[PDB]
């Protein structure tokens, strides 16, 4: 319930930002591109291009940043455990 009054944010894929001001330019995914504002809590730097960021759903404004995809085929092979085979 605490984090029920919290939030969702549709992830987004940044096409790129612009200057003399910010307004970051973005294509979400199943939808499309929106040139939209970014969260107040994130500088104009910690948001490089090609960065799957999270987007205030309705307001459609950068809410928070994130990290990169790796698919579920590369992570499925990271060993987790370890094979008992000493020298």
């Amino acid at each position: 319930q605490s984090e029920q009054p919290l939030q969702v944010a549709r992830c987004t894929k940044i096409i790129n930002a612009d200057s003399e001001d910010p307004k970051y330019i973005i294509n979400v995914k199943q939808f499309a591109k929106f040139v939209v504002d970014l969260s107040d809590q994130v500088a104009p730097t910690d948001i490089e291009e090609g960065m799957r960021v999270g987007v205030d759903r309705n307001k459609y404004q950068i809410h928070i940043p994130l990290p990169p995809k790796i698919d579920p085929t590369v992570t499925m092979m990271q060993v987790e455990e370890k094979p008992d085979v000493t020298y």
């Binding site: 894929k13 790129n16 612009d18 330019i25 040139v35 291009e49 090609g50």
Partner: peptide
Amino acid sequence: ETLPTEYDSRVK
């Protein structure tokens, strides 16, 4: 507004 132009994040 007019926007810059398309250009692939894969391209950049």
